[PDB]
Design a protein around this ligand. Structure first.
Ligand SMILES: O=C1Nc2ccccc2/C1=C1/Nc2ccccc2/C1=N\OCC[C@@H](O)CO
Lengths: 121, 266
């Protein structure tokens, strides 16, 4: 298994911004984040295809989040703006074979331990 | 000498108006239901071999299954005659479907003399082609097309793309009604990549490839072409990945990509 290293998250006031980052111990073609709110299904949020730099978002977060990566293709970054209570969840970094499937189902190869994100109004 | 005849096909009585297309295995004809006046495409496939029988019947089964999608020709009926009963001395398979307005290339030829294809029109052509392929890949098990090329695509009377050639398609038989393994879908995406390149640049990317360095018209597609022509099939995009990006491109250009491609109809 690839080893993932997660940072960022925590608490923020509604309408604010947080950034998550995630480092992989080796190259993979695709990296993303899914989240899980209480009682809810896993929800694919954002995913990047490294060689193409193409990026995929769920309907819930498109226009507010931006996923990007480092030049060395070892790390992904998630910038979350205009945050709302709906975005309170544990956010888990993940690798996947398919970003569109990932954004729709959160089907993953391997997943990190997660970070808490809480948004207060 | 098949045109002129009126042919029974179930309770349909169809007059064979003319030849639309030919080739190796089959002929395609325009036909008209004598009673109702309704029009169809009728594909007649002739067979002297059991192996061809299997190929032909498999193509029809694929057409039955995939019918019902906006971008696949609508299956209407099919029928056969054993060799004992036909004026060929051969097995006869008849396939009846919706009649389309023409082959896509014919319309591309005519647009060719009005400038390069508008990026919007390339987007509509390709999105609709990709939606058809996604419909095959979504089946459980996935149906793999294996011979995607622009010549095989049609344009319907309503100006939308229709995939019609399922004679090379394959899948797994007797699939339990768990596996999430790639089984050939990625070859389909490669073929699609070549179509997108072709539609933009009016040539095939191979006879390594090269997107024209100073193209500022089809720039919006450049990264998707490269992504669909990854040598490595695991790195190559799935059809869901391709379609997702095609919708984002569409949104960016304020285009409805499912709409009739009426620029091809003038
Ligand atoms: O309307 C149509 N429904 C179909 C179902 C199966 C196969 C062909 C067709 C078809 C066609 N309508 C037209 C109209 C003008 C010229 C060709 C043509 C057609 N099919 O042509 C078959 C060639 C294609 O399979 C190339 O590989």
């Amino acid at each position: 298994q690839v080893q993932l290293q997660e940072s960022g998250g925590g608490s923020v006031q509604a309408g604010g911004s947080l950034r998550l980052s995630c480092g992989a111990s080796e190259y993979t073609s695709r990296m993303g984040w899914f989240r899980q709110a209480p009682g809810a299904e896993r929800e694919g949020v954002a995913c990047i295809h490294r060689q193409s730099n193409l990026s995929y978002y769920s309907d819930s977060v498109r226009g507010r989040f931006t996923i990007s990566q480092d030049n060395a293709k070892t790390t992904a970054f998630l910038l979350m703006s205009s945050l709302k209570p709906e975005d309170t969840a544990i956010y888990y970094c993940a690798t996947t074979t398919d970003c569109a499937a990932f954004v729709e189902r959160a089907t993953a190869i391997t997943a990190g331990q997660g970070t808490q994100v809480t948004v207060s109004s | 000498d098949f045109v002129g005849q009126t042919v029974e096909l179930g309770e349909l009585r169809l007059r064979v108006r003319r030849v639309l297309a030919e080739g190796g295995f089959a002929f395609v004809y325009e036909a008209q239901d004598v009673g109702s006046g309704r029009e169809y495409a009728l594909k007649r496939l002739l067979s002297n071999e059991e192996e061809k029988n299997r190929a032909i019947i498999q193509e029809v089964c694929f057409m039955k299954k995939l019918s019902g999608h906006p971008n696949i020709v609508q299956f209407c009926s099919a029928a056969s005659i054993g060799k004992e009963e036909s004026d060929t001395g051969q097995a006869e398979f008849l396939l009846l479907t919706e009649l389309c307005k023409g082959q896509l290339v014919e319309f591309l030829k005519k647009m060719e003399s009005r400038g390069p294809l508008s990026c919007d029109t390339v987007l509509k052509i390709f999105y609709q082609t990709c939606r058809a392929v996604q419909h095959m890949h979504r089946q459980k098990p996935p149906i793999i097309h294996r011979d995607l090329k622009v010549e095989n695509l049609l344009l319907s009377n309503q100006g939308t793309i229709k995939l019609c050639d399922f004679g090379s398609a394959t899948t797994i038989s007797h699939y339990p009604d768990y596996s999430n393994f790639p089984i050939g879908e990625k070859q389909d995406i490669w073929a699609l990549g070549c179509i997108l390149y072709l539609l933009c640049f009016r040539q095939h990317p191979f006879e390594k490839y090269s997107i024209p360095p100073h193209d500022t018209q089809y720039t919006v597609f450049h990264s998707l072409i490269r992504a669909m022509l990854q040598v490595n099939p695991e790195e190559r995009l799935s059809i869901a990945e391709v379609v997702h990006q095609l919708q984002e491109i569409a949104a960016a250009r304020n285009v409805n990509p499912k709409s009739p491609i009426t620029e091809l109809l003038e």
